[PDB]
């Protein structure tokens, strides 16, 4: 055949892949964690968005730390040979490097490690996307007026907020990040490369949202998502 390029991930496998959505809204009373009002809006938006991208979506609600680990272990042990990629969305409370099960924390590394290039062979060389809507600390942004491959390769972590910062969620409209992500995927998934779509998400969250609170400490705050890429190729959700 003619000249061939290897700049983009092969996304024309029989299946796009799984999209696991872990939606934690209600937490065990003993944890002292608040109910995440508006998260169901996020979960539904994500389910529809990824369904239209042809992903096999599996929604899971209110999972304990043990259930989260079991689920990810089981999913990583499935045969992903006929799948182009893997997507996991985590909606919960969190801290830097941590996501909360309904009864306690789970290190994000524990979850992502199941999908390492050496631990999930049927996903080796394929994009593994982790979308995380959770806090990464307690900082508030005041804003300003205007052969072998690495086992950590091929992962993309789309964090809702910058390292060390809180992440915002509206009880009626859903989280700022997920609202924006779904809107940009619906509008550009058939036109732009993934990093460019995520950059549009960054701009949307950065410019269209600002917190409103009766508490001065939490009022008029801003947010910027954080794209962390270990991808080795361009990612387009469409093919041909």
């Amino acid at each position: 055949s003619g000249i061939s390029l290897d700049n983009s991930y092969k996304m024309d496998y029989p299946e796009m892949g799984l999209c696991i959505i872990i939606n934690n809204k209600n937490f065990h009373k003993s944890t002292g964690m608040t109910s995440r009002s508006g998260t169901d809006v996020d979960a539904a938006n994500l389910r529809e968005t990824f369904r239209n991208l042809k992903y096999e979506v599996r929604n899971k609600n209110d999972l304990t730390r043990e259930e989260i680990v079991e689920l990810m272990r089981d999913v990583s042990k499935e045969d992903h040979s006929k799948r182009s990629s893997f997507v996991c969305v985590l909606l919960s409370h969190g801290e830097e490097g941590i996501i909360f099960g309904t009864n306690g924390p789970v290190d994000l590394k524990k979850i992502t490690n199941f999908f390492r290039g050496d631990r999930c062979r049927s996903l080796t060389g394929k994009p593994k996307l982790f979308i995380i809507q959770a806090c990464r600390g307690t900082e508030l942004d005041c804003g300003i007026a205007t052969h072998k491959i690495p086992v950590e390769a091929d992962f993309l972590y789309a964090y809702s907020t910058a390292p060390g910062y809180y992440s915002w969620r509206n009880s009626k409209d859903g989280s700022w990040f997920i609202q924006s992500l779904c809107a940009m995927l619906k509008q550009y998934a058939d036109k732009l490369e993934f990093m460019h779509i995520l950059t549009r998400v960054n701009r949307k969250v950065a410019t269209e949202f600002e917190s409103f609170s009766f508490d001065a400490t939490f009022h008029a705050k801003k947010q910027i998502p954080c794209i962390v890429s270990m991808l080795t190729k361009e990612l387009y959700f469409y093919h041909h």
């Binding site: 009002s37 919960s92 806090c135 915002w168 509206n170 989280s175 917190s211």
Partner: peptide, 4 residues
């Protein structure tokens, strides 16, 4: 708005 609320924080996570």
């Amino acid at each position: 708005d609320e924080v996570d």
